[PDB]
Amino acid sequence: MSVAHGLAWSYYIGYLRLILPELQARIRTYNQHYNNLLRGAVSQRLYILLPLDCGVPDNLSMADPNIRFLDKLPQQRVYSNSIYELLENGQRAGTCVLEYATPLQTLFAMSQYSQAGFSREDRLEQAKLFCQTLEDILADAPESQNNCRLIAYQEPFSLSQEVLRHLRQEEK
Amino acid sequence: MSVAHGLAWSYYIGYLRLILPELQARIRTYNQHVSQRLYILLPLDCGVPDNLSMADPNIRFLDKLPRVYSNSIYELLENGQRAGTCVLEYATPLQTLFAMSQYSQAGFSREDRLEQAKLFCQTLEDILADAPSQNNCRLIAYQESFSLSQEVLRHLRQE
Numbered sequence A: 001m002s003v004a005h006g007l008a009w010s011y012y013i014g015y016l017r018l019i020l021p022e023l024q025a026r027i028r029t030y031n032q033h034y035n036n037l038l039r040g041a042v043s044q045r046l047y048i049l050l051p052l053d054c055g056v057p058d059n060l061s062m063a064d065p066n067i068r069f070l071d072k073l074p075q076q077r078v079y080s081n082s083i084y085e086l087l088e089n090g091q092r093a094g095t096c097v098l099e100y101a102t103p104l105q106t107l108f109a110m111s112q113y114s115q116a117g118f119s120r121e122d123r124l125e126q127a128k129l130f131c132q133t134l135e136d137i138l139a140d141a142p143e144s145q146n147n148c149r150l151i152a153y154q155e156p157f158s159l160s161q162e163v164l165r166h167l168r169q170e171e172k
Numbered sequence B: 001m002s003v004a005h006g007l008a009w010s011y012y013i014g015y016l017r018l019i020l021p022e023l024q025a026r027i028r029t030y031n032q033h034v035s036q037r038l039y040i041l042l043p044l045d046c047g048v049p050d051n052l053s054m055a056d057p058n059i060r061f062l063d064k065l066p067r068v069y070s071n072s073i074y075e076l077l078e079n080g081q082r083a084g085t086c087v088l089e090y091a092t093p094l095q096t097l098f099a100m101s102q103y104s105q106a107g108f109s110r111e112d113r114l115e116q117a118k119l120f121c122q123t124l125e126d127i128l129a130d131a132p133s134q135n136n137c138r139l140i141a142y143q144e145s146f147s148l149s150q151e152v153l154r155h156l157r158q159e
């Protein structure tokens, strides 16, 4: 329905269209001049986490102990994008720029506030339609699809393995 | 109906609920070491310019109010004299409604933009009426001779 439609368009206009054109250059700059020489290159593309239950925690490292914060990307009013290391059996298995799609926090809060007239069933339906609309916007957005990946997932699960699966899919 | 609903809720959850509880203390700190309340400009035609001072010469930037949130303090001039001073800013979700009316893929008409701008104001007013936020902010809705400085001064004198 139209709630998800407006949120996906807002997320694109007010944020993704402003950060994705220069993201590739920032990632290259970090790999060439800031990344520790004993580390693997940070993967290209912004990985956007889309929990379908709209459960967006405040700390990304507290959600999963295998997602460890590493550094902030060189800055692009201003935007702070974080680089995370994904651990598998203690070893570093991948490194990427990761963050939650914040409009799903709004969908969660709307399902909690009575005045919003928004059910928990409406939340799940609108979360899926938010992902659909955002995927359609990014499919034809100039310099945005090849610079980001949408990670949609449902929970009853390892969030670190969910991100690693998408990273290995791009490599294969 | 629902585009405006989602934007008003997003503006509250992702921004106003995080800045309005501590705004009164930041305003007091500036005065001790500018009127209370955040004045949110809501142009119903969704014409949000990038520079506030360029929109009206009688609205002059004075200083920034000390996640990082930067709010700007402005002086409102009347016949050259300083007639009021307040923390002022545009409701940025109206810039999204304007852009949606411009992008073909959004399937959003200019008529849909005016309807959704009014419903955004209505939903935001209802949220703020019962948010634990109302006494720390005021909504200035207007349709653009028109003077934006006089529009803000009218609300300041009403309080």
Ligand SMILES: CCn1nc(C)cc1C(=O)Nc1nc2cc(C(N)=O)cc(OC)c2n1C/C=C/Cn1c(NC(=O)c2cc(C)nn2CC)nc2cc(C(N)=O)cc(OC)c21
Residues within 6 Å of the ligand: A007, A008, A010, A011, A012, A013, A014, A015, A077, A078, A079, A080, A081, A102, A103, B006, B007, B008, B010, B011, B012, B013, B014, B015, B067, B068, B069, B070, B071, B092, B093, B096
């Ligand atoms: C608007 C795009 N959007 N739409 C949906 C749906 C979700 C998002 C979204 O995810 N936005 C987003 N993510 C970011 C991540 C980073 C990063 N990685 O560091 C940096 C960012 O920009 C600084 C990010 N932004 C931009 C805005 C962030 C919050 N914010 C707002 N927000 C709104 O007005 C608004 C309008 C509607 C509708 N909903 N909201 C609430 C979000 N006004 C602010 C004013 C000031 C100030 N006074 O200086 C400071 C702010 O926050 C520091 C302000």
